[PDB]
Amino acid sequence: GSVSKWVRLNVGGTYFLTTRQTLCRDPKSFLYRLCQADPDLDSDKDETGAYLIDRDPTYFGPVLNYLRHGKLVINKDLAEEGVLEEAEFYNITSLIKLVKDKIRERDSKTSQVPVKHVYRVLQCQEEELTQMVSTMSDGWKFEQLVSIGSSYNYGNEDQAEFLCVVSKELHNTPYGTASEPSEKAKILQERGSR
Amino acid sequence: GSVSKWVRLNVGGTYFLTTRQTLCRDPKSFLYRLCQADPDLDSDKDETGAYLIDRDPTYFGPVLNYLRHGKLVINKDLAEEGVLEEAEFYNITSLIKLVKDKIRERDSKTSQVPVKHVYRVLQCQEEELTQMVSTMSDGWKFEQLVSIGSSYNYGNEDQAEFLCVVSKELHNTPYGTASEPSEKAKILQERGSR
Amino acid sequence: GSVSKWVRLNVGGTYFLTTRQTLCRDPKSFLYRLCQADPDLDSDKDETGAYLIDRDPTYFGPVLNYLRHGKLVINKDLAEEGVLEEAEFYNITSLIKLVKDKIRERDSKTSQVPVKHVYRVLQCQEEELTQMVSTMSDGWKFEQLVSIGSSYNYGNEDQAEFLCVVSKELHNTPYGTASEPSEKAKILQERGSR
Amino acid sequence: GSVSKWVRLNVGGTYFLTTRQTLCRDPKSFLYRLCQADPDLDSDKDETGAYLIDRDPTYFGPVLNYLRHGKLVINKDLAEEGVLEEAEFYNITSLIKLVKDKIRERDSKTSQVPVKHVYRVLQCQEEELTQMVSTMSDGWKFEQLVSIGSSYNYGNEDQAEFLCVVSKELHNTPYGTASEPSEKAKILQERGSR
Amino acid sequence: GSVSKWVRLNVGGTYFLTTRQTLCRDPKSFLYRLCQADPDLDSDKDETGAYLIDRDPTYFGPVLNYLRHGKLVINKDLAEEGVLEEAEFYNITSLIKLVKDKIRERDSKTSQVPVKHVYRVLQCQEEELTQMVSTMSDGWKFEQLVSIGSSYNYGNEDQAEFLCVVSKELHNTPYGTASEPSEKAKILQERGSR
Amino acid sequence: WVMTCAYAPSGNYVACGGLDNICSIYNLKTREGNVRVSRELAGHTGYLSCCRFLDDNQIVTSSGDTTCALWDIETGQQTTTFTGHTGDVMSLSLAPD
Amino acid sequence: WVMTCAYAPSGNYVACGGLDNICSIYNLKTREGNVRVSRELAGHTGYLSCCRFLDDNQIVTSSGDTTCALWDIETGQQTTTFTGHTGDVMSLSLAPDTRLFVSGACDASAKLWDVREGMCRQTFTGHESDINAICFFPNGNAFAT
Amino acid sequence: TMDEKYVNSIWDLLKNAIQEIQRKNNSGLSFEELYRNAYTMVLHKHGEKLYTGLREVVTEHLINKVREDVLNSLNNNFLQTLNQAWNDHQTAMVMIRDILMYMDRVYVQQNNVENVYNLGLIIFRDQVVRYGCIRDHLRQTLLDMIARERKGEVVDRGAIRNACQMLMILGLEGRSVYEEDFEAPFLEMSAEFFQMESQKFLAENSASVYIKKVEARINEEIERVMHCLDKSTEEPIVKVVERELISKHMKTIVEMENSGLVH
Amino acid sequence: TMDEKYVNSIWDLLKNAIQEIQRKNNSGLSFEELYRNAYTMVLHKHGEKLYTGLREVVTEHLINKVREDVLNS
Amino acid sequence: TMDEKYVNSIWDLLKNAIQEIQRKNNSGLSFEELYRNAYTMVLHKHGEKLYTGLREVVTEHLINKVREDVLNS
């Protein structure tokens, strides 16, 4: 018994139970041919049931999660590259893009070594620094406050009295839409250079 | 035939025998509705009397862990987000709460990659300095100490002499990067802003 | 259930085939009931006949290894807190102490995750500064130096020369066993507070 | 038991019905020979005739997926070390080029065990920080920023007012020295020494 | 069957087919007990002809052992407790000390748990600064730079003008050794102490 | 290189358009007591040059590539697309109308 | 220990060569806004000594071990390998013609080559000591030494 | 952990473990057990002893079982023994390779020594083929069947095919082993056969009949060499044909006999 | 993220099933099936359209099935 | 570091499988082999020769077998 209304898949030798329609959420997937009752199968068995799917069941998880509820799952043990491979096996373009973004976010921190960390410098006095640090922005880490030597307006109680440099790591995908700037962007860049 | 004091449930490919009581964490949960037979359900595994529903057992893992044990601990290698997706499909507000708390804990644990990190500023005098660094609160990490000029009492030993700056990985928000606002809080924030 | 020298537990739907003798180590644990083939614990499965335990196999691992060969091995990819909870479920006090020691080692190693972290400030001038920086203890990490205004000359060779804030990643002990005050200690604390 | 296309695999003592191709992708693997029939097969038993394997593993999974798709597997808790240890052993021929990077990347991590950071001093006038701070180079991280006075006007609004100090890791493999047989480079180094 | 020269050890349930001879090496190993058929056994099954191995191969592998085919050794990510207990199972106090030293090496080269760090104060004036900052010793890491109050050249460029506090993380000794038997060294240490 | 910042009509959101192709929407006021990004708006073709809050859930964003399309803040998807210029739509005037 | 920094004619790139044996080309223009390294030219026989932007995507790299080979910046591959000196090629100068690069080496002989031909047009001799720096005439018809 | 004895259980002294499954007593060797601790193959240097012991155990299992069982057959069923020995060695060697791919990936090619699988092939070649009696057995056997097939009697080809295919594959990348063993004696007997055959066709046939018969037979022998031997041997026999049937009939061909050439 | 093609197709199917099961027909897909059918569109930010569709479907069905029956009775 | 061996093995498997499916084989033909081959040899920048070779095999199977069956009917 392979299908009556439900389908038992054999993903890489691992039996899984689902229904035709959960796979039919996206009717362009590779499992479409497998699940539907048709003699187009190039791998199946009716001696004990279940079509033969010779593919990763380990990386079938997040792909089936997207196939069921349109959401990618990024586990800590999950090779985002591997789930990208499985998604491209099961042709989910938006999942492909999202997993590519996940891969590049992970690489910009881990495999490409921590790079392009954003650093900013903020002028603050005491009355400003207290709540600025208190109201420190989301996803940003304090790095160093320094007290600038001052002679004008004493060396204290001056709007320009402290410099706080902060940072935010970019576990960020480099832009694939074009991380290379255009001509007018470079025009404005040279204008702002000096 | 298919229902008893215990019930066999086919989450994914595998079949778990669990009491009908344990499967429900709130009577709005879909699992409880699946515990008793409904005229709407058509596709099921009548081969062993176990209802067929289509979700990953890996994110059912922490869900059933909380349901059986009453406390939710999501593994450091598994997506707490997958647990949240499982809960939201199964419509368990309690699990929504715990996944929320676990995600806050993880954001504290992942407060190195961009997610809010609390930072605070304290005043101290030269004398008080040793005390308040020594008596600095557990769960907080000292980040910086800055000497300043003394506007009172010579150049040293001033009630405003050193600014300590500490931090906490856990974010100050009620949840993650976004919490449901309240209007009176904004009213008072505007009141104190001016 | 079925009678055998071993026993097959349905730990979270997962068959643990372990000998009955290794489960007789702690009658004070739920397992020693599950090993009874006589009607002291009767449990079966309508597919295999395995006994049923509604405890997770997630943290059952290290506890079962502690039962088998006398020593716990918490895998460093699973929450030691979950192992402590599993130890609590079987309420093995030695196992509780061992997992709490593991969590203490974690917190000492993860003092920057918000747990115990000790801090101090030394006072020295340059001459002794080099000495005690060089003779800094193993475990105590230098975190910041700072100068303090010197009434002698303008700088060096004044007793008030340099504060030296140093730190150490200290273990956080799970509560209920640590940080328990005493009456005469509080008397002396009140005496020294002023 | 070769009685049909599905054959018996012994893992955990359980017998799994796996198709030939889930065991067969190349002649180098061990699962291949169990799909080939010869009278020297001594893996036969007296229960059902299933073929016995040592496998009861913890790291065979993602690297079997690697065999099945040919992309090295790095997890957020199992980095290029995991490739370098398991993906080598499962005998994927394409890894030899890939693992080299995994080898260098691994070296690039282990080379920083004797911490090798390129340290740079950049003098800046105060008005000149935020630019070159905001335009910090990739892989270059800000580390320190120390004020300094000057002979004229106490230092502020002068080029000798701040010293930024930045550091960059090495992706280099571990070294003990760097040498090239060019004598004139040594001449130039000695000339620039004074 | 397991009553003949061949046996089927149920290691983690998995049937490992092995000669009694390869398992009968000496009684120091646990396995010698199981393969050798003797009265008073309760670790054996006569329903299938197998001697059970209660230890699943999940820390049967990292056991420090010799004289067959396998692998061992604590890695930089392998648990300390498992290797420690597996060494203690192989007796010798020298073995215990050496395995502890190996764990301290793998934890102290990065200085985590042994937490072994070295700190130095380099007295450099301004012009020299970028020199030893740029020409720092590899295997080290800069930590702080602090100016010094000066009485010559407007407080800038003194013979002592900056303390560069540098550090490095590594074991002074991977064994964690201390105390020297040379009394002349002690005499000299006391002489240089005052 | 952030070109534009526009203060929302409600005075509690702020918008940022820089050389990046993402429009930043910071919810300045929340019960959190500090600024956190309400919405990152991705999918801009050209670089943002000027932007103006048409609402607090949608905004006009004159990006590059002749695009000054209306953008839904919540969904992050442009709803009405404004094309027809040459080069980047660089200026953006909001009427009291 | 960097002894050569060359500014590109466009200014979008800068080249530096030290004892790393690697010619670093840094892109000064990014939509990210951060100065990221354009290209790492690895494969020189010795240490770089003097490099010049005859192109924004090509660069002449007078390096150690008697080489002043030309590199295509885009591919990171050698464009016009130059060999023939006895001492390492340490100085270099581009003519305003942008067609004659004369390289001062430790062979005490200024070899004026052809930029993209792989051939040394001539070998001006007369210095008994290594040529420190070469500056062309404002026409490329001559150069001091 | 890396140093000092931990003897009597697992790891080290694997000659016995290897030769257990080389006798096809298979349940798996230890692969699951060594999967996890593999960041110590090259960083703690157990690879030198492992490589040396692997070479030694392969050599010893070649001499102890493979060689003397190869030698017991002179030229009949010697083909079957060689094929079975090669099959068994390859079966053992392929599961051998999986255990030690990391050290073979780094240290072996760092030491400029041949690949572990290629090392096993080299050791089999040294221990079976390159030893004198077996080598002469192969040479004489291939020569005898090729000559007998050339003489007009039908013989089996699958055996000579698998033996020759060994000779190529055991020759590493080239046909060095085959060239040293059979290619040259094959060329010699082929030259002799072409010469005597052309002479007998000239003697027993007239001019046109000699031409037709010799062309048909050249085609037949080329067909046999594709059918009884491999592809790479066709060019040598082609040049032998050129030097034995045309280059030795350049100037004895102008007038032939009976129907001649001018006729 | 808004796109209306599959949302309207699945709402066609959902209203068809609504009419079937509100006609007391045992068919009408599985409860999990219809639940997911609605779920994909409600997560897709078009729940207002579904609200109106349910409103009008229930409206006309009740008017033409039971309102006139109550009038008849 | 070399690439040619598994590249030609990939071509072998791809062409054998394409021929089998074009000859409508109803057994075997692991998808894992197909996609492993495809990714592993497009990664090293042989996607162009995949494009050309797949075009070629499709073209030739169009010409040799099915076109004549079109003509002879």
Short mmCIF file of C-alpha atoms in Angstrom, two decimals, chain C residues 3-6 17-19 21-22 64-65 68-69 71-76 98 102 105 108-110 126 129-130 133-147 153-156 161-162 168-169, chain E residues 10 12-13 41-45 52 54-56 58-59 76-83 85 106-107 111-121 143-144 146-151 155 158 160 163 165-166 172:
data_model
loop_
_atom_site.label_atom_id
_atom_site.label_comp_id
_atom_site.label_asym_id
_atom_site.label_seq_id
_atom_site.Cartn_x
_atom_site.Cartn_y
_atom_site.Cartn_z
CA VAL C 3 10.08 -10.92 29.49
CA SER C 4 13.79 -10.71 28.69
CA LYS C 5 17.08 -10.31 30.53
CA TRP C 6 17.28 -6.84 29.02
CA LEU C 17 17.45 -1.74 25.04
CA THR C 18 19.37 -1.82 28.31
CA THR C 19 20.00 -4.61 30.79
CA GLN C 21 20.86 -5.11 36.19
CA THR C 22 22.27 -1.71 35.24
CA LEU C 64 21.84 6.18 31.73
CA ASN C 65 25.61 6.24 31.17
CA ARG C 68 25.84 1.95 33.47
CA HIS C 69 29.47 2.83 34.21
CA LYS C 71 30.27 8.32 35.75
CA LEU C 72 28.20 10.92 33.94
CA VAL C 73 29.37 12.20 30.58
CA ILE C 74 27.32 15.24 29.59
CA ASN C 75 27.82 15.67 25.86
CA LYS C 76 29.13 19.19 25.20
CA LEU C 98 27.87 16.02 39.35
CA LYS C 102 29.33 20.62 35.32
CA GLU C 105 32.34 24.68 35.27
CA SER C 108 33.05 29.78 35.21
CA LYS C 109 33.88 29.17 31.55
CA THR C 110 30.80 31.17 30.48
CA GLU C 126 54.51 52.24 38.35
CA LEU C 129 52.77 48.27 38.92
CA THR C 130 55.19 46.36 36.72
CA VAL C 133 51.18 43.08 36.55
CA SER C 134 54.00 40.62 35.94
CA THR C 135 53.04 38.62 39.04
CA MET C 136 49.36 38.62 38.14
CA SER C 137 47.57 35.48 39.29
CA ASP C 138 46.68 32.65 36.90
CA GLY C 139 42.95 33.03 36.37
CA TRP C 140 42.73 36.72 37.13
CA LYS C 141 42.75 38.70 33.89
CA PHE C 142 43.84 42.32 33.67
CA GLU C 143 40.98 44.39 32.28
CA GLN C 144 41.92 48.04 32.66
CA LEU C 145 44.50 50.37 34.09
CA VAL C 146 43.89 54.01 34.87
CA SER C 147 45.89 56.90 36.23
CA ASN C 153 55.01 66.82 40.46
CA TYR C 154 52.40 66.22 37.75
CA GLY C 155 52.61 62.47 37.25
CA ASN C 156 54.61 59.40 38.28
CA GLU C 161 49.27 56.73 40.58
CA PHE C 162 47.38 53.82 39.01
CA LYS C 168 38.21 36.65 36.85
CA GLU C 169 35.61 34.43 35.21
CA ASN E 10 24.92 -6.45 21.39
CA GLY E 12 24.17 -0.44 21.80
CA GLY E 13 21.82 -3.16 20.62
CA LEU E 41 26.25 -14.66 34.25
CA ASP E 42 23.37 -12.25 34.03
CA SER E 43 24.36 -10.41 30.86
CA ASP E 44 23.41 -12.97 28.21
CA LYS E 45 20.47 -13.99 26.03
CA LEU E 52 24.81 -8.21 25.56
CA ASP E 54 25.19 -2.67 27.89
CA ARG E 55 27.49 0.15 26.76
CA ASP E 56 26.22 1.78 23.59
CA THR E 58 28.77 6.67 22.46
CA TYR E 59 31.60 6.73 24.97
CA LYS E 76 39.96 20.01 21.71
CA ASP E 77 36.19 19.44 21.75
CA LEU E 78 36.02 16.00 23.37
CA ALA E 79 34.72 15.88 26.93
CA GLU E 80 37.22 15.98 29.78
CA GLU E 81 35.09 13.83 32.10
CA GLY E 82 34.77 10.95 29.64
CA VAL E 83 38.48 10.77 28.89
CA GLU E 85 37.05 8.26 33.62
CA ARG E 106 44.30 21.31 25.54
CA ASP E 107 42.45 23.70 27.87
CA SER E 111 43.71 29.18 28.69
CA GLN E 112 40.11 28.16 29.44
CA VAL E 113 39.45 26.50 32.84
CA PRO E 114 43.19 26.53 33.65
CA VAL E 115 42.82 30.19 32.52
CA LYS E 116 46.55 30.86 32.17
CA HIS E 117 47.55 34.29 30.88
CA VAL E 118 50.76 36.30 30.82
CA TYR E 119 50.95 40.08 31.17
CA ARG E 120 53.76 42.58 30.70
CA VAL E 121 54.26 46.32 30.96
CA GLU E 143 45.65 45.15 25.79
CA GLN E 144 46.01 48.74 26.96
CA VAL E 146 48.30 54.53 29.21
CA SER E 147 50.16 57.83 29.20
CA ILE E 148 52.29 59.10 32.08
CA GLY E 149 52.31 62.50 33.69
CA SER E 150 55.50 64.26 32.71
CA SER E 151 57.50 67.28 33.85
CA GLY E 155 54.16 66.75 29.65
CA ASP E 158 59.29 62.02 28.86
CA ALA E 160 58.86 57.47 30.72
CA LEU E 163 52.98 52.03 29.61
CA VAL E 165 50.26 46.73 28.90
CA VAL E 166 50.44 43.69 26.63
CA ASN E 172 53.16 28.83 30.97
#
